[PDB]
Amino acid sequence: MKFSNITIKNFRNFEKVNINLDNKNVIFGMNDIGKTNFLYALRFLLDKEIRKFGFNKSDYHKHDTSKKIEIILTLDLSNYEKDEDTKKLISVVKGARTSANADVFYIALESKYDDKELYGNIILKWGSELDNLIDIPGRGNINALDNVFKVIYINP
Amino acid sequence: MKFSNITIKNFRNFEKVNINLDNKNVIFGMNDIGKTNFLYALRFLLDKEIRKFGFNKSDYHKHDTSKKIEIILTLDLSNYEKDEDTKKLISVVKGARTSANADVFYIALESKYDDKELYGNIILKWGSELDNLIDIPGRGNINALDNVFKVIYINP
């Protein structure tokens, strides 16, 4: 598969940033805070060690305005017709894609507002279409996405 | 509501320990490790900040023998017939208790084997009877038992 794009609808430093993606991505620039918050957004979407802590009040654009954090990722689930990797790639999930002829896949994140109980409540949803998004099945503490993607973080 | 008993089927220091319970409990003795492991078992049951870390390899009786941790707490859900706290105590849950004339309530903890993937995977289930225990619905990172019990831990 091949990553297509990422949209961050709200974060601690982002307002409506949409970045097209691929494999072997390289990020640079003047703003170090934006790069480290992009990497923290990737950790929040793709790792359990940052997901289990929840969202804190300081991780918003304004600390009380527009309390709705959405981080969307696209997967491009379809492979070539000469390679049989499509069925092995699809068969990890069953009910996410309604039709077998779908082209792309979505992974989304949703944050409950921090007005009451002062806690983030990370909710993970996937699905083949943006409308009628469905939850990720977690039978205990480990959800179904954690068996698919393993994130190894390297920092000197 | 009045605690009845606690059963620890396996822990880092317990084998077949069953302790009767009540409110306003005082624990003392020569063995400090048993007291702190009893308190840690209570923290693993009713506090989320220790529940979210899962179980390690060292939290077993022997490090490869009898990998089945069960911690059972009895609740005594029924109250007196002249006080209307019974309905307000029952109405936090709906599908756990099959009959309205049920007397006792169970809260159980289950830990998967640590042989594969090196993680504990805490599974929590409650129910009015010991058999056919149903899972607590956790829609995000917070289950329904979190809104019931608030644990305040004091240690200088």
PDB file of C-alpha atoms in Angstrom:
ATOM      1  CA  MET A   1       0.000   0.000   0.000  1.00  0.00           C
ATOM      2  CA  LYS A   2       0.895   3.678  -0.315  1.00  0.00           C
ATOM      3  CA  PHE A   3      -0.012   6.615   1.931  1.00  0.00           C
ATOM      4  CA  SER A   4      -1.958   9.368   0.166  1.00  0.00           C
ATOM      5  CA  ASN A   5      -2.713  12.363   2.420  1.00  0.00           C
ATOM      6  CA  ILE A   6      -3.229  13.568   5.992  1.00  0.00           C
ATOM      7  CA  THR A   7      -5.596  16.308   7.199  1.00  0.00           C
ATOM      8  CA  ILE A   8      -5.359  17.747  10.725  1.00  0.00           C
ATOM      9  CA  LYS A   9      -8.605  19.588  11.445  1.00  0.00           C
ATOM     10  CA  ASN A  10      -7.415  20.815  14.875  1.00  0.00           C
ATOM     11  CA  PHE A  11      -4.308  20.383  17.021  1.00  0.00           C
ATOM     12  CA  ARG A  12      -2.108  22.487  19.301  1.00  0.00           C
ATOM     13  CA  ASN A  13      -0.512  24.292  16.336  1.00  0.00           C
ATOM     14  CA  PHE A  14      -2.593  23.396  13.249  1.00  0.00           C
ATOM     15  CA  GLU A  15      -5.849  24.852  11.921  1.00  0.00           C
ATOM     16  CA  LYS A  16      -6.629  23.387   8.470  1.00  0.00           C
ATOM     17  CA  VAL A  17      -3.355  21.818   7.345  1.00  0.00           C
ATOM     18  CA  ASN A  18      -3.645  19.228   4.557  1.00  0.00           C
ATOM     19  CA  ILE A  19      -0.458  17.407   3.517  1.00  0.00           C
ATOM     20  CA  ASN A  20      -0.236  14.898   0.688  1.00  0.00           C
ATOM     21  CA  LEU A  21       1.742  11.817   1.697  1.00  0.00           C
ATOM     22  CA  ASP A  22       3.721   8.906   0.267  1.00  0.00           C
ATOM     23  CA  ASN A  23       6.241   6.355   1.462  1.00  0.00           C
ATOM     24  CA  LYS A  24       9.678   7.505   2.710  1.00  0.00           C
ATOM     25  CA  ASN A  25       8.550  10.978   3.765  1.00  0.00           C
ATOM     26  CA  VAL A  26      11.009  13.730   4.722  1.00  0.00           C
ATOM     27  CA  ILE A  27       9.876  16.814   6.663  1.00  0.00           C
ATOM     28  CA  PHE A  28      11.931  19.972   7.209  1.00  0.00           C
ATOM     29  CA  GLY A  29      11.483  23.697   7.641  1.00  0.00           C
ATOM     30  CA  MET A  30      11.977  26.723   9.850  1.00  0.00           C
ATOM     31  CA  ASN A  31       9.231  25.883  12.370  1.00  0.00           C
ATOM     32  CA  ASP A  32      10.424  23.067  14.638  1.00  0.00           C
ATOM     33  CA  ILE A  33       7.195  23.109  16.683  1.00  0.00           C
ATOM     34  CA  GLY A  34       5.106  22.275  13.616  1.00  0.00           C
ATOM     35  CA  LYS A  35       7.364  19.347  12.703  1.00  0.00           C
ATOM     36  CA  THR A  36       7.367  17.887  16.216  1.00  0.00           C
ATOM     37  CA  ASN A  37       3.586  18.339  16.464  1.00  0.00           C
ATOM     38  CA  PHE A  38       3.176  16.594  13.094  1.00  0.00           C
ATOM     39  CA  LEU A  39       5.221  13.689  14.465  1.00  0.00           C
ATOM     40  CA  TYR A  40       3.164  13.769  17.678  1.00  0.00           C
ATOM     41  CA  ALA A  41      -0.016  13.644  15.568  1.00  0.00           C
ATOM     42  CA  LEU A  42       1.383  10.547  13.843  1.00  0.00           C
ATOM     43  CA  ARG A  43       2.144   9.063  17.281  1.00  0.00           C
ATOM     44  CA  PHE A  44      -1.382   9.896  18.484  1.00  0.00           C
ATOM     45  CA  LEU A  45      -2.956   8.209  15.462  1.00  0.00           C
ATOM     46  CA  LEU A  46      -0.633   5.216  15.122  1.00  0.00           C
ATOM     47  CA  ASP A  47       0.744   4.330  18.584  1.00  0.00           C
ATOM     48  CA  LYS A  48      -0.827   3.123  21.834  1.00  0.00           C
ATOM     49  CA  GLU A  49       1.830   4.640  24.137  1.00  0.00           C
ATOM     50  CA  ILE A  50       0.543   8.135  23.328  1.00  0.00           C
ATOM     51  CA  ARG A  51      -3.101   7.114  22.765  1.00  0.00           C
ATOM     52  CA  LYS A  52      -3.598   5.699  26.266  1.00  0.00           C
ATOM     53  CA  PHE A  53      -2.912   9.064  27.956  1.00  0.00           C
ATOM     54  CA  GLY A  54      -5.761  10.958  26.271  1.00  0.00           C
ATOM     55  CA  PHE A  55      -5.935  14.610  25.275  1.00  0.00           C
ATOM     56  CA  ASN A  56      -4.983  17.372  27.706  1.00  0.00           C
ATOM     57  CA  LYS A  57      -6.399  20.948  27.639  1.00  0.00           C
ATOM     58  CA  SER A  58      -3.170  22.442  26.232  1.00  0.00           C
ATOM     59  CA  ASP A  59      -3.413  20.299  23.062  1.00  0.00           C
ATOM     60  CA  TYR A  60      -5.883  22.584  21.270  1.00  0.00           C
ATOM     61  CA  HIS A  61      -5.615  25.509  18.854  1.00  0.00           C
ATOM     62  CA  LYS A  62      -7.313  27.840  21.285  1.00  0.00           C
ATOM     63  CA  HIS A  63      -7.717  26.410  24.770  1.00  0.00           C
ATOM     64  CA  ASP A  64     -11.530  26.704  24.784  1.00  0.00           C
ATOM     65  CA  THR A  65     -12.482  27.481  21.152  1.00  0.00           C
ATOM     66  CA  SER A  66     -13.410  24.792  18.565  1.00  0.00           C
ATOM     67  CA  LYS A  67     -12.977  21.681  20.708  1.00  0.00           C
ATOM     68  CA  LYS A  68     -13.110  19.158  17.864  1.00  0.00           C
ATOM     69  CA  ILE A  69      -9.866  17.406  16.887  1.00  0.00           C
ATOM     70  CA  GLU A  70      -9.930  15.310  13.710  1.00  0.00           C
ATOM     71  CA  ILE A  71      -6.868  13.583  12.242  1.00  0.00           C
ATOM     72  CA  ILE A  72      -7.674  11.737   9.009  1.00  0.00           C
ATOM     73  CA  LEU A  73      -5.350   9.379   7.131  1.00  0.00           C
ATOM     74  CA  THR A  74      -5.795   7.665   3.757  1.00  0.00           C
ATOM     75  CA  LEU A  75      -4.320   4.294   2.851  1.00  0.00           C
ATOM     76  CA  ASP A  76      -4.875   3.415  -0.873  1.00  0.00           C
ATOM     77  CA  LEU A  77      -5.856  -0.145  -0.054  1.00  0.00           C
ATOM     78  CA  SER A  78      -5.946  -1.340  -3.671  1.00  0.00           C
ATOM     79  CA  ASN A  79      -2.908  -3.022  -5.230  1.00  0.00           C
ATOM     80  CA  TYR A  80      -2.035  -3.988  -8.800  1.00  0.00           C
ATOM     81  CA  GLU A  81      -4.098  -6.629 -10.587  1.00  0.00           C
ATOM     82  CA  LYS A  82      -0.993  -8.752 -11.276  1.00  0.00           C
ATOM     83  CA  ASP A  83      -0.195  -8.958  -7.540  1.00  0.00           C
ATOM     84  CA  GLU A  84      -2.320 -10.952  -5.083  1.00  0.00           C
ATOM     85  CA  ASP A  85      -1.455  -8.661  -2.144  1.00  0.00           C
ATOM     86  CA  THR A  86      -4.932  -7.063  -2.335  1.00  0.00           C
ATOM     87  CA  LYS A  87      -6.753  -9.939  -0.613  1.00  0.00           C
ATOM     88  CA  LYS A  88      -4.141 -10.321   2.147  1.00  0.00           C
ATOM     89  CA  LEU A  89      -4.195  -6.544   2.660  1.00  0.00           C
ATOM     90  CA  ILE A  90      -8.007  -6.406   2.810  1.00  0.00           C
ATOM     91  CA  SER A  91      -8.667  -9.523   4.923  1.00  0.00           C
ATOM     92  CA  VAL A  92      -7.438  -8.047   8.234  1.00  0.00           C
ATOM     93  CA  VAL A  93     -10.746  -6.143   8.522  1.00  0.00           C
ATOM     94  CA  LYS A  94     -14.130  -7.502   7.433  1.00  0.00           C
ATOM     95  CA  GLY A  95     -16.998  -5.046   7.958  1.00  0.00           C
ATOM     96  CA  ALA A  96     -15.198  -1.779   7.209  1.00  0.00           C
ATOM     97  CA  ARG A  97     -15.553  -1.921   3.410  1.00  0.00           C
ATOM     98  CA  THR A  98     -19.094  -2.622   2.202  1.00  0.00           C
ATOM     99  CA  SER A  99     -18.165  -3.451  -1.408  1.00  0.00           C
ATOM    100  CA  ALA A 100     -15.136  -5.449  -2.539  1.00  0.00           C
ATOM    101  CA  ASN A 101     -14.506  -3.012  -5.424  1.00  0.00           C
ATOM    102  CA  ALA A 102     -13.529  -0.087  -3.177  1.00  0.00           C
ATOM    103  CA  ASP A 103     -10.304   1.768  -3.975  1.00  0.00           C
ATOM    104  CA  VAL A 104      -9.134   3.686  -0.885  1.00  0.00           C
ATOM    105  CA  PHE A 105      -9.293   3.265   2.908  1.00  0.00           C
ATOM    106  CA  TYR A 106      -9.624   5.786   5.744  1.00  0.00           C
ATOM    107  CA  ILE A 107      -8.283   5.933   9.300  1.00  0.00           C
ATOM    108  CA  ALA A 108      -9.714   8.746  11.422  1.00  0.00           C
ATOM    109  CA  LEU A 109      -9.356  10.120  14.949  1.00  0.00           C
ATOM    110  CA  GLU A 110     -11.975  11.959  17.010  1.00  0.00           C
ATOM    111  CA  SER A 111     -11.646  13.799  20.321  1.00  0.00           C
ATOM    112  CA  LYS A 112     -14.391  14.423  22.867  1.00  0.00           C
ATOM    113  CA  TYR A 113     -14.498  17.989  24.199  1.00  0.00           C
ATOM    114  CA  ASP A 114     -12.623  18.858  27.392  1.00  0.00           C
ATOM    115  CA  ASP A 115     -15.342  20.996  29.016  1.00  0.00           C
ATOM    116  CA  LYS A 116     -16.490  18.228  31.387  1.00  0.00           C
ATOM    117  CA  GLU A 117     -14.374  15.769  33.461  1.00  0.00           C
ATOM    118  CA  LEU A 118     -11.080  17.254  32.028  1.00  0.00           C
ATOM    119  CA  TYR A 119     -10.167  14.226  29.910  1.00  0.00           C
ATOM    120  CA  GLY A 120      -9.673  13.657  26.192  1.00  0.00           C
ATOM    121  CA  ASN A 121     -11.505  10.394  25.291  1.00  0.00           C
ATOM    122  CA  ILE A 122      -9.654   9.317  22.150  1.00  0.00           C
ATOM    123  CA  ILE A 123     -12.031   7.549  19.736  1.00  0.00           C
ATOM    124  CA  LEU A 124     -10.652   5.627  16.744  1.00  0.00           C
ATOM    125  CA  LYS A 125     -12.793   4.972  13.664  1.00  0.00           C
ATOM    126  CA  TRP A 126     -11.991   3.396  10.300  1.00  0.00           C
ATOM    127  CA  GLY A 127     -14.000   2.670   7.180  1.00  0.00           C
ATOM    128  CA  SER A 128     -13.985   2.765   3.413  1.00  0.00           C
ATOM    129  CA  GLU A 129     -16.095   5.948   3.157  1.00  0.00           C
ATOM    130  CA  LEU A 130     -16.035   9.169   5.160  1.00  0.00           C
ATOM    131  CA  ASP A 131     -19.793   8.956   5.760  1.00  0.00           C
ATOM    132  CA  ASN A 132     -21.141   6.230   8.152  1.00  0.00           C
ATOM    133  CA  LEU A 133     -17.776   5.797   9.861  1.00  0.00           C
ATOM    134  CA  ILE A 134     -17.631   2.804  12.206  1.00  0.00           C
ATOM    135  CA  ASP A 135     -15.640   2.191  15.379  1.00  0.00           C
ATOM    136  CA  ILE A 136     -12.479   0.087  15.681  1.00  0.00           C
ATOM    137  CA  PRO A 137     -13.310  -3.148  17.577  1.00  0.00           C
ATOM    138  CA  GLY A 138     -11.398  -3.363  20.837  1.00  0.00           C
ATOM    139  CA  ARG A 139     -12.354  -6.443  22.848  1.00  0.00           C
ATOM    140  CA  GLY A 140     -10.181  -5.594  25.854  1.00  0.00           C
ATOM    141  CA  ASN A 141      -7.613  -2.806  25.937  1.00  0.00           C
ATOM    142  CA  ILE A 142      -5.930  -3.660  22.598  1.00  0.00           C
ATOM    143  CA  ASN A 143      -7.935  -2.575  19.557  1.00  0.00           C
ATOM    144  CA  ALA A 144      -7.945  -4.239  16.146  1.00  0.00           C
ATOM    145  CA  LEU A 145      -5.683  -1.599  14.559  1.00  0.00           C
ATOM    146  CA  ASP A 146      -2.792  -2.368  16.936  1.00  0.00           C
ATOM    147  CA  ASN A 147      -2.258  -5.836  15.431  1.00  0.00           C
ATOM    148  CA  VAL A 148      -1.878  -4.279  11.952  1.00  0.00           C
ATOM    149  CA  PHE A 149       0.557  -1.375  12.306  1.00  0.00           C
ATOM    150  CA  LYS A 150       3.598  -1.447  14.595  1.00  0.00           C
ATOM    151  CA  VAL A 151       5.327   1.895  15.189  1.00  0.00           C
ATOM    152  CA  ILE A 152       9.022   1.976  16.111  1.00  0.00           C
ATOM    153  CA  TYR A 153      10.128   5.425  17.281  1.00  0.00           C
ATOM    154  CA  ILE A 154      13.825   6.347  17.138  1.00  0.00           C
ATOM    155  CA  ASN A 155      15.137   9.467  18.876  1.00  0.00           C
ATOM    156  CA  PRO A 156      18.745  10.158  20.010  1.00  0.00           C
TER     157      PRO A 156
ATOM    158  CA  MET B   1     -23.811  -0.572  49.244  1.00  0.00           C
ATOM    159  CA  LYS B   2     -21.532  -2.900  51.203  1.00  0.00           C
ATOM    160  CA  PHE B   3     -18.492  -4.881  50.068  1.00  0.00           C
ATOM    161  CA  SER B   4     -18.743  -8.609  50.807  1.00  0.00           C
ATOM    162  CA  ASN B   5     -15.538 -10.418  49.779  1.00  0.00           C
ATOM    163  CA  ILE B   6     -12.514 -10.319  47.475  1.00  0.00           C
ATOM    164  CA  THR B   7     -10.922 -13.352  45.792  1.00  0.00           C
ATOM    165  CA  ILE B   8      -7.470 -13.211  44.177  1.00  0.00           C
ATOM    166  CA  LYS B   9      -6.982 -16.321  42.047  1.00  0.00           C
ATOM    167  CA  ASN B  10      -3.416 -15.403  41.001  1.00  0.00           C
ATOM    168  CA  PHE B  11      -1.119 -12.428  41.553  1.00  0.00           C
ATOM    169  CA  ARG B  12       2.556 -11.757  42.224  1.00  0.00           C
ATOM    170  CA  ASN B  13       2.221 -12.974  45.828  1.00  0.00           C
ATOM    171  CA  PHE B  14      -1.213 -14.651  46.118  1.00  0.00           C
ATOM    172  CA  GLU B  15      -2.349 -18.182  45.255  1.00  0.00           C
ATOM    173  CA  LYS B  16      -5.805 -18.989  46.740  1.00  0.00           C
ATOM    174  CA  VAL B  17      -6.444 -16.003  48.996  1.00  0.00           C
ATOM    175  CA  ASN B  18     -10.063 -15.144  49.841  1.00  0.00           C
ATOM    176  CA  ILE B  19     -10.719 -12.193  52.166  1.00  0.00           C
ATOM    177  CA  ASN B  20     -14.117 -11.168  53.496  1.00  0.00           C
ATOM    178  CA  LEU B  21     -14.845  -7.465  53.061  1.00  0.00           C
ATOM    179  CA  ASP B  22     -16.948  -4.629  54.454  1.00  0.00           C
ATOM    180  CA  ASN B  23     -16.768  -0.853  54.503  1.00  0.00           C
ATOM    181  CA  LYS B  24     -14.040   0.980  56.474  1.00  0.00           C
ATOM    182  CA  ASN B  25     -11.396  -1.731  56.197  1.00  0.00           C
ATOM    183  CA  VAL B  26      -8.078  -1.799  58.066  1.00  0.00           C
ATOM    184  CA  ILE B  27      -5.244  -4.066  56.899  1.00  0.00           C
ATOM    185  CA  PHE B  28      -2.078  -4.746  58.902  1.00  0.00           C
ATOM    186  CA  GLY B  29       0.483  -7.454  59.503  1.00  0.00           C
ATOM    187  CA  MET B  30       4.109  -8.491  59.287  1.00  0.00           C
ATOM    188  CA  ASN B  31       4.226  -9.020  55.506  1.00  0.00           C
ATOM    189  CA  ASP B  32       4.352  -5.589  53.862  1.00  0.00           C
ATOM    190  CA  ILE B  33       4.537  -7.041  50.336  1.00  0.00           C
ATOM    191  CA  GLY B  34       1.172  -8.763  50.746  1.00  0.00           C
ATOM    192  CA  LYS B  35      -0.459  -5.526  51.914  1.00  0.00           C
ATOM    193  CA  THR B  36       0.990  -3.467  49.062  1.00  0.00           C
ATOM    194  CA  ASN B  37       0.011  -6.148  46.529  1.00  0.00           C
ATOM    195  CA  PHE B  38      -3.539  -6.232  47.931  1.00  0.00           C
ATOM    196  CA  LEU B  39      -3.666  -2.445  47.526  1.00  0.00           C
ATOM    197  CA  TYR B  40      -2.217  -2.757  44.013  1.00  0.00           C
ATOM    198  CA  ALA B  41      -4.870  -5.358  43.132  1.00  0.00           C
ATOM    199  CA  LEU B  42      -7.497  -2.868  44.317  1.00  0.00           C
ATOM    200  CA  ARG B  43      -5.825  -0.197  42.159  1.00  0.00           C
ATOM    201  CA  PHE B  44      -5.817  -2.565  39.172  1.00  0.00           C
ATOM    202  CA  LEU B  45      -9.532  -3.222  39.655  1.00  0.00           C
ATOM    203  CA  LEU B  46     -11.014   0.205  40.432  1.00  0.00           C
ATOM    204  CA  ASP B  47      -8.446   2.733  39.134  1.00  0.00           C
ATOM    205  CA  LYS B  48      -7.856   3.418  35.440  1.00  0.00           C
ATOM    206  CA  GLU B  49      -4.389   4.983  35.769  1.00  0.00           C
ATOM    207  CA  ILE B  50      -2.926   1.607  36.751  1.00  0.00           C
ATOM    208  CA  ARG B  51      -5.326  -0.349  34.503  1.00  0.00           C
ATOM    209  CA  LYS B  52      -4.141   1.371  31.309  1.00  0.00           C
ATOM    210  CA  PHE B  53      -0.561   0.067  31.681  1.00  0.00           C
ATOM    211  CA  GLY B  54      -1.532  -3.608  31.410  1.00  0.00           C
ATOM    212  CA  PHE B  55       0.183  -6.518  33.116  1.00  0.00           C
ATOM    213  CA  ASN B  56       3.907  -7.241  32.902  1.00  0.00           C
ATOM    214  CA  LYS B  57       5.863 -10.498  33.181  1.00  0.00           C
ATOM    215  CA  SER B  58       6.754  -9.949  36.847  1.00  0.00           C
ATOM    216  CA  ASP B  59       3.112  -9.752  38.007  1.00  0.00           C
ATOM    217  CA  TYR B  60       2.542 -13.511  38.225  1.00  0.00           C
ATOM    218  CA  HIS B  61       3.027 -16.138  40.927  1.00  0.00           C
ATOM    219  CA  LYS B  62       5.740 -17.961  39.045  1.00  0.00           C
ATOM    220  CA  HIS B  63       7.092 -16.240  35.959  1.00  0.00           C
ATOM    221  CA  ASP B  64       5.721 -18.895  33.574  1.00  0.00           C
ATOM    222  CA  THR B  65       3.383 -21.062  35.705  1.00  0.00           C
ATOM    223  CA  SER B  66      -0.409 -20.568  36.107  1.00  0.00           C
ATOM    224  CA  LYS B  67      -0.958 -17.616  33.771  1.00  0.00           C
ATOM    225  CA  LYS B  68      -4.571 -16.930  34.745  1.00  0.00           C
ATOM    226  CA  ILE B  69      -5.248 -13.875  36.924  1.00  0.00           C
ATOM    227  CA  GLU B  70      -8.767 -13.471  38.310  1.00  0.00           C
ATOM    228  CA  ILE B  71      -9.761 -10.808  40.840  1.00  0.00           C
ATOM    229  CA  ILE B  72     -13.415 -10.998  41.895  1.00  0.00           C
ATOM    230  CA  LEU B  73     -15.255  -8.424  44.003  1.00  0.00           C
ATOM    231  CA  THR B  74     -18.760  -8.939  45.406  1.00  0.00           C
ATOM    232  CA  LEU B  75     -20.939  -5.867  45.729  1.00  0.00           C
ATOM    233  CA  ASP B  76     -24.238  -6.657  47.587  1.00  0.00           C
ATOM    234  CA  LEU B  77     -26.353  -4.496  45.296  1.00  0.00           C
ATOM    235  CA  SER B  78     -29.598  -4.857  47.267  1.00  0.00           C
ATOM    236  CA  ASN B  79     -30.560  -2.454  50.067  1.00  0.00           C
ATOM    237  CA  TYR B  80     -33.388  -2.122  52.589  1.00  0.00           C
ATOM    238  CA  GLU B  81     -37.015  -2.076  51.456  1.00  0.00           C
ATOM    239  CA  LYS B  82     -37.835   1.170  53.302  1.00  0.00           C
ATOM    240  CA  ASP B  83     -35.167   3.209  51.463  1.00  0.00           C
ATOM    241  CA  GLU B  84     -35.185   4.073  47.754  1.00  0.00           C
ATOM    242  CA  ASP B  85     -31.421   3.886  47.161  1.00  0.00           C
ATOM    243  CA  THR B  86     -31.915   0.474  45.510  1.00  0.00           C
ATOM    244  CA  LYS B  87     -33.278   1.816  42.208  1.00  0.00           C
ATOM    245  CA  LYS B  88     -30.659   4.583  41.999  1.00  0.00           C
ATOM    246  CA  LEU B  89     -27.925   2.035  42.739  1.00  0.00           C
ATOM    247  CA  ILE B  90     -29.251  -0.454  40.163  1.00  0.00           C
ATOM    248  CA  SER B  91     -29.985   2.041  37.359  1.00  0.00           C
ATOM    249  CA  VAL B  92     -26.325   2.748  36.503  1.00  0.00           C
ATOM    250  CA  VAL B  93     -26.355  -0.556  34.576  1.00  0.00           C
ATOM    251  CA  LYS B  94     -29.222  -2.158  32.647  1.00  0.00           C
ATOM    252  CA  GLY B  95     -28.175  -5.419  30.969  1.00  0.00           C
ATOM    253  CA  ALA B  96     -25.888  -6.832  33.665  1.00  0.00           C
ATOM    254  CA  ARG B  97     -28.610  -8.104  36.024  1.00  0.00           C
ATOM    255  CA  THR B  98     -31.217 -10.360  34.419  1.00  0.00           C
ATOM    256  CA  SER B  99     -33.909 -10.169  37.123  1.00  0.00           C
ATOM    257  CA  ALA B 100     -35.073  -7.280  39.296  1.00  0.00           C
ATOM    258  CA  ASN B 101     -35.054  -9.543  42.384  1.00  0.00           C
ATOM    259  CA  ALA B 102     -31.323 -10.302  42.124  1.00  0.00           C
ATOM    260  CA  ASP B 103     -29.391  -9.943  45.377  1.00  0.00           C
ATOM    261  CA  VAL B 104     -25.629  -9.824  44.706  1.00  0.00           C
ATOM    262  CA  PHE B 105     -23.402  -8.261  42.030  1.00  0.00           C
ATOM    263  CA  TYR B 106     -20.003  -9.452  40.789  1.00  0.00           C
ATOM    264  CA  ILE B 107     -17.132  -7.463  39.281  1.00  0.00           C
ATOM    265  CA  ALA B 108     -14.350  -9.531  37.725  1.00  0.00           C
ATOM    266  CA  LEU B 109     -10.906  -8.979  36.218  1.00  0.00           C
ATOM    267  CA  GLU B 110      -9.298 -11.168  33.556  1.00  0.00           C
ATOM    268  CA  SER B 111      -5.748 -11.150  32.201  1.00  0.00           C
ATOM    269  CA  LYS B 112      -4.687 -12.881  28.994  1.00  0.00           C
ATOM    270  CA  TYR B 113      -1.504 -14.956  28.864  1.00  0.00           C
ATOM    271  CA  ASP B 114       1.776 -13.063  28.533  1.00  0.00           C
ATOM    272  CA  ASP B 115       3.417 -15.782  26.411  1.00  0.00           C
ATOM    273  CA  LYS B 116       2.708 -13.931  23.145  1.00  0.00           C
ATOM    274  CA  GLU B 117       3.139 -10.195  22.316  1.00  0.00           C
ATOM    275  CA  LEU B 118       4.503  -9.446  25.869  1.00  0.00           C
ATOM    276  CA  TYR B 119       1.454  -7.496  27.046  1.00  0.00           C
ATOM    277  CA  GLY B 120      -1.145  -8.145  29.738  1.00  0.00           C
ATOM    278  CA  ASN B 121      -4.415  -7.134  27.979  1.00  0.00           C
ATOM    279  CA  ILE B 122      -6.675  -6.463  30.966  1.00  0.00           C
ATOM    280  CA  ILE B 123     -10.227  -7.663  30.274  1.00  0.00           C
ATOM    281  CA  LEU B 124     -12.963  -6.517  32.662  1.00  0.00           C
ATOM    282  CA  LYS B 125     -16.414  -8.077  32.999  1.00  0.00           C
ATOM    283  CA  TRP B 126     -19.244  -7.742  35.514  1.00  0.00           C
ATOM    284  CA  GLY B 127     -22.534  -9.517  36.112  1.00  0.00           C
ATOM    285  CA  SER B 128     -25.112 -10.470  38.699  1.00  0.00           C
ATOM    286  CA  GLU B 129     -24.151 -14.170  38.684  1.00  0.00           C
ATOM    287  CA  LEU B 130     -20.779 -15.904  38.459  1.00  0.00           C
ATOM    288  CA  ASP B 131     -21.640 -17.545  35.138  1.00  0.00           C
ATOM    289  CA  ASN B 132     -22.394 -15.735  31.817  1.00  0.00           C
ATOM    290  CA  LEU B 133     -20.476 -12.583  32.749  1.00  0.00           C
ATOM    291  CA  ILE B 134     -20.820  -9.837  30.148  1.00  0.00           C
ATOM    292  CA  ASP B 135     -18.235  -7.276  29.103  1.00  0.00           C
ATOM    293  CA  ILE B 136     -18.317  -3.676  30.307  1.00  0.00           C
ATOM    294  CA  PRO B 137     -18.952  -1.488  27.227  1.00  0.00           C
ATOM    295  CA  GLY B 138     -16.048   0.876  26.708  1.00  0.00           C
ATOM    296  CA  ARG B 139     -16.887   3.114  23.764  1.00  0.00           C
ATOM    297  CA  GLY B 140     -13.607   5.042  23.738  1.00  0.00           C
ATOM    298  CA  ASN B 141     -10.788   4.939  26.281  1.00  0.00           C
ATOM    299  CA  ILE B 142     -13.281   5.067  29.189  1.00  0.00           C
ATOM    300  CA  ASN B 143     -15.492   2.158  30.227  1.00  0.00           C
ATOM    301  CA  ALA B 144     -18.808   2.322  32.073  1.00  0.00           C
ATOM    302  CA  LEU B 145     -17.212   1.275  35.382  1.00  0.00           C
ATOM    303  CA  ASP B 146     -15.139   4.493  35.423  1.00  0.00           C
ATOM    304  CA  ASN B 147     -18.218   6.698  35.949  1.00  0.00           C
ATOM    305  CA  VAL B 148     -19.235   4.484  38.904  1.00  0.00           C
ATOM    306  CA  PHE B 149     -16.130   4.463  41.108  1.00  0.00           C
ATOM    307  CA  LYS B 150     -13.754   7.365  41.734  1.00  0.00           C
ATOM    308  CA  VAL B 151     -10.578   6.236  43.508  1.00  0.00           C
ATOM    309  CA  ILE B 152      -8.606   8.792  45.529  1.00  0.00           C
ATOM    310  CA  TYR B 153      -5.197   7.502  46.625  1.00  0.00           C
ATOM    311  CA  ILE B 154      -3.390   9.223  49.507  1.00  0.00           C
ATOM    312  CA  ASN B 155       0.288   8.511  50.188  1.00  0.00           C
ATOM    313  CA  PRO B 156       2.741  11.033  51.750  1.00  0.00           C
TER     314      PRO B 156
END
